[PDB]
Symmetry: C2
Subunit: 307 residues, 2 copies
């Protein structure tokens, strides 16, 4: 009942600092676990006899056990950082046992309050489920195809009435002066071919390019909503008010993903329709808070320390 | 409402044949999807406009769409078979988009009856959660340690009263005359060191060796139980009756994993105590059915076609 576990990457700064400070101003104690640093710099131990099976965690000369953890913040769950040119089977077993051990430790925290529960996060990461559920709840989506059939993709390029089509893929953005990195959906233009031997029969996600006057970033924390907008014309986030009908749909989308935290990307078309693009793959909200003074970290701390 | 989807590996024979035939004797139509053959030989397509977003599946010149699927049998969910010496980033994207596309297709079958639902299976695969839950429900487990702290492992070797300790790892068994393969937990004896540079800080699972007069394979299908035993002394499965107190604990274990199908490994000690070892990692039941005429496939077909 005495620490808030904050799960991040070791190269994360602004968002973790704000949440961590908001947590201690509330009276609680945060503990930062860089998940990329397991297993090289983090030790986990658990013993089972049918007694209590609790876990002990050590990281940077600090240590906690699982009954101390009262809430968990899933800022970033990263794959194990493994250094070098390791033999492939040794590597495969290290990575698989590391993931298994971590999953064992997350299960030992099942009674803490999670923002958010890992099973929800893993499911919600899938863009195809997002689109299916968004359209079911009444959100507008861009026409979208997933296929490993080149014929079906060829046919899809003709049904987008007459617009461009892009391929979609999650990527990491790192440069741009600031020393932080972001997860974002890259959009390469689709100009066909049958090459890419190494991707020949591999499925891809294709989506109709939609015209925008605004990009929206909608961050929802436990029923609080925080909205930034960018004017689009090839930026600084600006305030924006969403209609309540859209907010109600977002909550139904969010409760069907089992999530209490979400960052959503929308566009507003010239015609004025809100189009859902995706749950932002990195849950990225730091620019909103600083550029606009939106107290997102406070709402995060509030959920973690008081529900 | 017109096919039972059977998810297997393309090198699976006995178990899929029995279930498939039991299904058609009931009046239903099975459709075999070898998941290892996606994406090279299986085509998946889905289109989203907010209309219906259904999926089309083709495999070996047969095709179905997701509204035809009434039930799904998760015999084997295998990673994508990818052939060759592919460029690592192309490979990484193919594999990640293949998994994403498959997960999209499984979501489109969310209204069919699953044996078992994939979220349960993925969670239940974790041996550490199995042990935690087994001891909570009152099943006896062998003393077990997971750690990447060599000191903690050293200490564990002294607390097993005075028995041998093995390391545990999931592996694939393929030879032994018969042309099928099995998932099983390998047990290498623990004789320490600080080498294995490639596994130096990597967690491992250590377990006290327990004496056995019997190994048990307990297969449960929708509240029906099927038990095989092997006499241990360095075999042919033989009948065995479990006490009802153990059966009640198994059902509580199974309902806490959200599973309607499970293959469990136990040992019976010389002293006569049933010790839980693990949910059999491959759900392996084929030898039981043939060596002992236990109608496991019939119970599987029955669940899939009628609930």
């Amino acid at each position: 009942p005495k620490v808030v576990l904050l799960l991040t990457h070791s190269g994360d700064f602004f968002t973790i600092d704000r949440v961590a400070e908001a947590i201690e101003k509330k009276g609680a104690t945060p503990f930062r676990l860089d998940t990329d640093k397991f297993p090289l710099e983090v030790q986990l131990t658990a013993q089972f006899n049918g007694k209590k099976s609790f876990y002990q965690l050590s990281y940077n000369h600090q240590s906690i056990d699982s009954e101390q953890v009262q809430s968990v913040w899933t800022r970033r769950i990263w794959q194990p950082e493994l250094t070098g040119d390791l033999d492939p089977q040794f590597r495969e077993v290290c990575v698989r046992e590391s993931q298994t051990t971590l999953a064992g430790f997350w299960d030992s925290l099942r009674s803490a309050r999670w923002l958010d529960n890992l099973a929800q996060i893993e499911k919600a990461k899938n863009k195809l489920l997002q689109l299916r559920l968004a359209s079911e709840v009444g959100l507008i989506i861009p026409p979208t195809l997933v296929t490993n059939n080149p014929d079906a993709a060829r046919e899809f390029f003709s049904q987008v009435q007459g617009r461009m089509v892009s391929k979609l893929l999650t990527a990491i953005a790192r440069s741009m002066e600031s020393p932080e990195f972001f997860l974002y959906t890259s959009r390469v233009k689709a100009e066909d071919l049958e090459e890419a031997e190494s991707l020949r029969y591999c499925p891809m996600v294709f989506q109709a390019e939609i015209p925008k006057q605004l990009e929206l970033r909608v961050v929802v924390v436990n029923g609080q909503t925080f909205v930034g907008a960018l004017e689009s014309s090839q930026g600084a986030w600006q305030h924006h008010t969403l209609p309540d009908s859209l907010l109600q749909q977002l909550q139904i989308f969010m409760a069907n993903l089992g999530l209490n935290f979400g960052a959503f990307d929308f566009i507003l078309t010239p015609g004025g329709e809100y189009v859902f693009l995706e749950v932002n793959p990195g849950g990225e909200w730091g620019m909103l808070e600083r550029d606009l003074d939106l107290p997102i970290s406070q709402a995060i701390a509030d959920f973690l320390v008081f529900g």
